[PDB]
Amino acid sequence: AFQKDAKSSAYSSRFQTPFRRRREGKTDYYQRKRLVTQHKAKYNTPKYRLVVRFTNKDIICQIISSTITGDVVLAAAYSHELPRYGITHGLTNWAAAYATGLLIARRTLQKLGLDETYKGVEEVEGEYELTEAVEDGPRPFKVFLDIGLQRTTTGARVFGALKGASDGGLYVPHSENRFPGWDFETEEIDPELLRSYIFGGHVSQYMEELADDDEERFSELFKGYLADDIDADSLEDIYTSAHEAIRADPAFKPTEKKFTKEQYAAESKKYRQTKLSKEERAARVAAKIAALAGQQ
Amino acid sequence: QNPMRDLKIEKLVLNISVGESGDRLTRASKVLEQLSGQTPVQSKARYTVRTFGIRRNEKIAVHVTVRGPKAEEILERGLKVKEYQLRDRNFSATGNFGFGIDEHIDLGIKYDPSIGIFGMDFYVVMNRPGARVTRRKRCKGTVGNSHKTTKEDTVSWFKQKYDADVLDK
Amino acid sequence: ARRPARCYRYQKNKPYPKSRYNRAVPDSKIRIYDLGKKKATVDEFPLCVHLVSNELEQLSSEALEAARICANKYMTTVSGRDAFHLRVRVHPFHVLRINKMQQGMRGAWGKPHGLAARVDIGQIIFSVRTKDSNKDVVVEGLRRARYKFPGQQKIILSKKWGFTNLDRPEYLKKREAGEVKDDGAFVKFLSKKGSLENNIREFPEYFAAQA
Amino acid sequence: GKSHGYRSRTRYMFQRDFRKHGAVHLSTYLKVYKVGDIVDIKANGSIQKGMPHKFYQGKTGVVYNVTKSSVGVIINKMVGNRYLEKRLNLRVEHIKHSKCRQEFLERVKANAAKRAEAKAQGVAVQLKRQPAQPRESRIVSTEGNVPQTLAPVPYETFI
RNA sequence: AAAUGACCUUGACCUAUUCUCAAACUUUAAAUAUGUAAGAAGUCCUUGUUACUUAAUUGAACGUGGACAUUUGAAUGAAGA
RNA sequence: AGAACAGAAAUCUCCAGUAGAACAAAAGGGUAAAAGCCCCCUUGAUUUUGAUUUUCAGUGUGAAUACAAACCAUGAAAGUG
RNA sequence: GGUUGCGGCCAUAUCUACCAGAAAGCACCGUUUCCCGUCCGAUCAACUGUAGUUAAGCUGGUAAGAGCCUGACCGAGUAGUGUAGUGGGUGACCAUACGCGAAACUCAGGUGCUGCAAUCU
Numbered sequence A: 001a002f003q004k005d006a007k008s009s010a011y012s013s014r015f016q017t018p019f020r021r022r023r024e025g026k027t028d029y030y031q032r033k034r035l036v037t038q039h040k041a042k043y044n045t046p047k048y049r050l051v052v053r054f055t056n057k058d059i060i061c062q063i064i065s066s067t068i069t070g071d072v073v074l075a076a077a078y079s080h081e082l083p084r085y086g087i088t089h090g091l092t093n094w095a096a097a098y099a100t101g102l103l104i105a106r107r108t109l110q111k112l113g114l115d116e117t118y119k120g121v122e123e124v125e126g127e128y129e130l131t132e133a134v135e136d137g138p139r140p141f142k143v144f145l146d147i148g149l150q151r152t153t154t155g156a157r158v159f160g161a162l163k164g165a166s167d168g169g170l171y172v173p174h175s176e177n178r179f180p181g182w183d184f185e186t187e188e189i190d191p192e193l194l195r196s197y198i199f200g201g202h203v204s205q206y207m208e209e210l211a212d213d214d215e216e217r218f219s220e221l222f223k224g225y226l227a228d229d230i231d232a233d234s235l236e237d238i239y240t241s242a243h244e245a246i247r248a249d250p251a252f253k254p255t256e257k258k259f260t261k262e263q264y265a266a267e268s269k270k271y272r273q274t275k276l277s278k279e280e281r282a283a284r285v286a287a288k289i290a291a292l293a294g295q296q
Numbered sequence B: 001q002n003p004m005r006d007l008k009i010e011k012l013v014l015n016i017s018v019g020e021s022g023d024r025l026t027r028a029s030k031v032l033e034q035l036s037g038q039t040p041v042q043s044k045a046r047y048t049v050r051t052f053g054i055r056r057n058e059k060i061a062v063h064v065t066v067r068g069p070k071a072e073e074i075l076e077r078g079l080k081v082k083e084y085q086l087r088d089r090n091f092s093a094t095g096n097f098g099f100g101i102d103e104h105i106d107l108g109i110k111y112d113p114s115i116g117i118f119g120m121d122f123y124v125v126m127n128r129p130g131a132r133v134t135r136r137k138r139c140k141g142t143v144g145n146s147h148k149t150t151k152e153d154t155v156s157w158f159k160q161k162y163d164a165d166v167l168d169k
Numbered sequence C: 001a002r003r004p005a006r007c008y009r010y011q012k013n014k015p016y017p018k019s020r021y022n023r024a025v026p027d028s029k030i031r032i033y034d035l036g037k038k039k040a041t042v043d044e045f046p047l048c049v050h051l052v053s054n055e056l057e058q059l060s061s062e063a064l065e066a067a068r069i070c071a072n073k074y075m076t077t078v079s080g081r082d083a084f085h086l087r088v089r090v091h092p093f094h095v096l097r098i099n100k101m102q103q104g105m106r107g108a109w110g111k112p113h114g115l116a117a118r119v120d121i122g123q124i125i126f127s128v129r130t131k132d133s134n135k136d137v138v139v140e141g142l143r144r145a146r147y148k149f150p151g152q153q154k155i156i157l158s159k160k161w162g163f164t165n166l167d168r169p170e171y172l173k174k175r176e177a178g179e180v181k182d183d184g185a186f187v188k189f190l191s192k193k194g195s196l197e198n199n200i201r202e203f204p205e206y207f208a209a210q211a
Numbered sequence D: 001g002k003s004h005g006y007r008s009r010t011r012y013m014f015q016r017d018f019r020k021h022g023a024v025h026l027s028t029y030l031k032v033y034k035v036g037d038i039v040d041i042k043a044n045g046s047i048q049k050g051m052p053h054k055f056y057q058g059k060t061g062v063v064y065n066v067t068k069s070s071v072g073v074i075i076n077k078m079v080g081n082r083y084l085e086k087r088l089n090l091r092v093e094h095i096k097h098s099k100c101r102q103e104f105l106e107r108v109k110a111n112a113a114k115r116a117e118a119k120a121q122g123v124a125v126q127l128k129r130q131p132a133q134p135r136e137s138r139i140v141s142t143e144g145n146v147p148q149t150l151a152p153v154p155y156e157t158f159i
Numbered sequence E: 001a002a003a004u005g006a007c008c009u010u011g012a013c014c015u016a017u018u019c020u021c022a023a024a025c026u027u028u029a030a031a032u033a034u035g036u037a038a039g040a041a042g043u044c045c046u047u048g049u050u051a052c053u054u055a056a057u058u059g060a061a062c063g064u065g066g067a068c069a070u071u072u073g074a075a076u077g078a079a080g081a
Numbered sequence F: 001a002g003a004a005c006a007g008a009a010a011u012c013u014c015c016a017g018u019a020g021a022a023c024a025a026a027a028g029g030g031u032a033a034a035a036g037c038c039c040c041c042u043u044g045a046u047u048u049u050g051a052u053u054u055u056c057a058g059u060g061u062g063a064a065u066a067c068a069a070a071c072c073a074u075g076a077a078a079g080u081g
Numbered sequence G: 001g002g003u004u005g006c007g008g009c010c011a012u013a014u015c016u017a018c019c020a021g022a023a024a025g026c027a028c029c030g031u032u033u034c035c036c037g038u039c040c041g042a043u044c045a046a047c048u049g050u051a052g053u054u055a056a057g058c059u060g061g062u063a064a065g066a067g068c069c070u071g072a073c074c075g076a077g078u079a080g081u082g083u084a085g086u087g088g089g090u091g092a093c094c095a096u097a098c099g100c101g102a103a104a105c106u107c108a109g110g111u112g113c114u115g116c117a118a119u120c121u
Ligand SMILES: [Mg+2]
Pocket: A009
């Protein structure tokens, strides 16, 4: 850095470091405190979070609860699972976000026992609804959306995950005003448009409009849609069939591994440098003051 | 080693400091509008001076930041006025550069006495790809030393393309 | 108009500095703490003699200045003004009050009367460095200064080298090999700790393990 | 005139622990309290709500209530020649589970074990605690260690 | 001739040093004092009650039934409490 | 450290920055994706009657804390008020 | 072992300068029809995962490095302090007896450990 900047030892000495996960720019604790903590008179009742994160085009849904030793995953679903259910493209998109949520919804809701009862909306006309408690039966499983550092904006796809997880039978308390199709100057939801996003309508129409306007770009991006021969119209039935596949068998097959833990460890340990002994460190000093010191 | 790191212009920011608010300022504003294609932004005075004749919060000036191909055009268009010769100053240690011109007519822009004549501060901030690390919300980082823009590097960049001169010392 | 110094001899009060809670206090009568040749190099003045207090008491700023003059005056006219380096080791930071005077003992909080240096037993008051050849001269300087002070103080010959913290042989060992480097009136020492880079920029005469 | 307000005199008491300022770590809220639990009271200056009065700083007591953000704590405070019962509403940031009974709980569970293991062999227990006893006799060897003889040392200076 | 000229000059600033200080300064931090605990109102197991609470006969509080006695859980004292 | 008029002080940019600022007011605590600064939506500065802490006689008054029963505000929400 | 998402303790994780990073992942990165936000699609929103890159982020290693953490009959049984005397001293103060006992200093050692889920030559 610059000379007149530097840092005093005095500066470094009194410096209080933030939490590691804040220094990493990952966890927002002000939100986390208020997400996690439980009514003290509910004792060991956990507070489950529906955690949604977007990598550069991969989607992550985990239902997570807290322990002072560390957090605990009840269940997890990623958008890269979607090829199993018949979605090979655009795994980062709104409709993909919906699907994954539904996947996460059915998956845990299954392994809790609430599989059969509480199926949520099977119709998906995109109406605004919460899964209601069943008269004389178990209350539904309750989960709170953890948006992380994502900005809340109306039409954001973090609320896509929310929609499918809600549509999947989970109880995720929410309002309608961040869903695509929310009107600014009147508080009203257009369900026609929200239904359109669930099925990828905004992507299909863009495919349409590039079909005849500019075919230079349509070839660049959407390239893969050509290779498998999928044009716009059929996209609604890709995601419709996806939903049914998910609801039929949510159960989460893992990858086949191939090269066990030991095996990956051996190969990776090659590329990790190792520290030295104080002996080695000392030997370098003495060597240095034989050379740099002793007049060449 | 230079794969990726290039010197893009991050943004160009035009600035006109008018000694007061009212008709003169909104005219300076109209200049930046039709010149930048964007609606400019105006700045209030931070405190009161009275030998400069200004009151705190008075809307003293207007400016605009332009990015993309647009910025290169206005850069070039002003560099022509400066006759493609800058000085060894104008170049910050952090790698940006700027100049200024009286009489905005020297770049395109016909006269129109209902408007009048204004000067401009031109200021160019250079950077490379991967600057997002500093500006993004999540995992906000700082760019590594070798990646950082330096004065030496930007003078060099400025000498090569535009084929202009640095002069001085 | 100064009260007789008998009045302030003992430390009866918690320290009362000049401060934002005080502010009105008068200037110290002793404003210079370094006399003689103060620019001089550590090597030039090996011998060090101290004026050392045997009491726990208070010394007025007036008496420090008075004694400063006394010692410095004697030393120069006898041994020369560049012969020695005199250092007053004690700074009068404690403010003495006074209640000056219809009204009685009512509301008796005093106003600043003057300054005093608080002083321990074994606590050093003056320090002087010279050539060994000058020892008698310096000692007579401190001995005369004594008459300007309340309470008992004694003069002690140091085991150290001038104003350093090292004893005479221990200093030589460090110097006569590599590790001592001049600074204006003082010396810097070579550390085994730290960057090997600029450790050898400074002290280049080391790392020969020789003279 | 004099000033006796609620937080008076509390300057360093409610101060924050050097290089410990800021948000309170999340484990403080993950802890769980039950009626009857024994807690220690220490105020957290960053949390202005639900704060103990300074008198109860460093004081230990028992939980008589559990509520949303807080726990009620009863404390015997002595005023006059007697103790009166005090009931404190405190937020969980100012309360900590006490280890004051830990050794006892440990010592009980260990005592049950030794007692069963004793009965199952036979008798011979001795499970009460005993004070430090004086040392037994011993034989110290001069081999390899012959007494070094020390004298007091003369007066010196080194100033 | 000027210089965003060079060179002396004194100020402030920066760097690494140096002498000395604090009731209303301080990283560190005593001694003396000070809170609680050292069991039968204790520990453990089995599984009832409810309008609280849980995704949930989940938990929370209060219970029924069962297991272990004076080394039953430090010291000293006790013209008793 | 850089930019016409522009100067010690106007407006523009980048870098450094543990808070060295700001939070009506005295001071002291406290606070950094806030408790500070800019914006959006608001009236919980509301309704009912008890318990509690400081001062204490364990009276009153002031101020405050944690719940219960309402009606509301805000936020995607947990929450918060 | 690596990596990611959510974490616990919150510098042995911070800071300054260099160098190295397989595979995967993260990343940077392309685009502006759509929801959405801007003086500026830079941030923010969406779309593609295609067109490109390990340069930066990120991970690790180096340094008689700064800071930080730990230890020691290092200093020091020192400073301070509870109890005692018809002890010393004009006094200021100071020794002694039965106890408790620091901080600085100095030297040595160290430079994140770890929970849940997923993935990877
Ligand atoms: Mg230093």
